[PDB]
Structure 1
Amino acid sequence: KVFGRCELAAAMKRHGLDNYRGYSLGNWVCAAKFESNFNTQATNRNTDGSTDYGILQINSRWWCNDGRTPGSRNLCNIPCSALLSSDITASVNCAKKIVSDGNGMNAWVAWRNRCKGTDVQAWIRGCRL
C-alpha cells in the first residue's frame, strides 16, 4: 500500500507512536517518507547482504528473519515479509523495540540525515488527528 501523508500519521497515532520515547509524530512520518516514500512494499538490499523491509526499512541483520541473512538476529521475532503488509502493526511494534535500544531514531539513517533538526511538525500540518 502507498499511504497518504495524513493517513499514515493517523495510523501511527492509533498505534501509539506519537511522542513514543519522546519522538513527536512528525518525526515518524518524516522517517517513513524518506525511507520508503510511504510504500509498505519497499525493499532495499544492503552491501553486507542484509535487506531492509517496509515502510520503516527495518533491517534483516538484527530485526527480522528473511532466511537469507547468515549470522543475523531476529530481535522482533517476525518474518521480514510481515513488515510489507498494508497493516502497519508489525512494523510499528518492531520500530518501538528499535527506538528503545539506546540510539533512539538515529538507527534510521534517513531520519538523521533528512529529518533530525528540521521542522518535522510540517509533516503533520493540516491533518485531522
Structure 2
Amino acid sequence: KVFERCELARVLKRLGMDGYRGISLANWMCLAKWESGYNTRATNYNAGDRSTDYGIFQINSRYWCNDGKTPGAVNACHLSCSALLQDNIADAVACAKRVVRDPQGIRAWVAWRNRCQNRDVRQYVQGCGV
C-alpha cells in the first residue's frame, strides 16, 4: 500500500507515535517519506552485507526481524520480516518503536540524519489535522 501523506500522518498519531521517545510525528513522516515513499511493500537488498530493509520504515533484517537468510542476524522485534510488508502497519509501528528504544534513537536510520535532522520538517504534517 502507498499511503497518501495526511492519511499516514493521522494513522501514526492514532498509533501513538507523536512524541514517542521524544520523536515528533513530523520526524516519523520525514523518515517514512525518504525510506520508502510511504510504500509498505518496499524492499531493498543490501548486497554488501546480505541484509534486506523491509517496509514503510525500511527496517533491517540483521537486527530487527527474521528472514532466515541474513547471516549472524537477530530478531529484536520478534517478527518475521514478512510482517513488515502488510498493508496494516501496526506491526511495522511496534517494531519502529523498538528500534528507537536503543540509545541512537531516530539516528539509527542514516536517511534521517541526511534528509531530516536540523531541517524544517513542518511540511510533512501541515494541513493534515494532527
TM-score, scaled relative to structure 2 = 0.97
**Counterpart Cα distance in 2 of 1:86 and 1:10:** 15
The equivalent residue for 1:28 is 28
Correspondence list, 1:89-108, <5 A: 89-108=90-109
**Counterpart Cα distance in 1 of 2:106 and 2:14:** 20
Spell out structure 1 runs of 4+ moving beyond 3 A.
none
Letter in structure 1 aligned against 2:4: G
The equivalent residue for 1:117 is 118
Alpha-carbon displacement from aligned partner over 1:53-99 (angstroms, at most 9, x marks no partner): 00000000000000110210001000001001111111110011111
Query: Structure 1, unaligned stretches of length 5 or more?
Result: none
**Identity value in percent:** 60
Alpha-carbon displacement from aligned partner over 1:28-51 (angstroms, at most 9, x marks no partner): 000000000100000001120000
Letter in structure 1 aligned against 2:111: A
Query: Structure 2, unaligned stretches of length 5 or more?
Result: none
The equivalent residue for 1:88 is 89
CA drift at 1:21: 0.9
CA drift at 1:128: 2.0
Determine whether 1:41 maps to 2:41.
yes
**Counterpart Cα distance in 2 of 1:6 and 1:110:** 21
Letter in structure 2 aligned against 1:41: R
**Counterpart Cα distance in 1 of 2:107 and 2:100:** 8
| Aligned-CA RMSD value | 0.7
TM-score, scaled relative to structure 1 = 0.98
**Counterpart Cα distance in 1 of 2:39 and 2:119:** 23
The equivalent residue for 2:64 is 63
The 3-state SS of whatever aligns with 1:78 is coil
The 3-state SS of whatever aligns with 1:45 is strand
CA drift at 1:109: 1.1
CA drift at 1:105: 0.6
**Counterpart Cα distance in 1 of 2:84 and 2:103:** 22
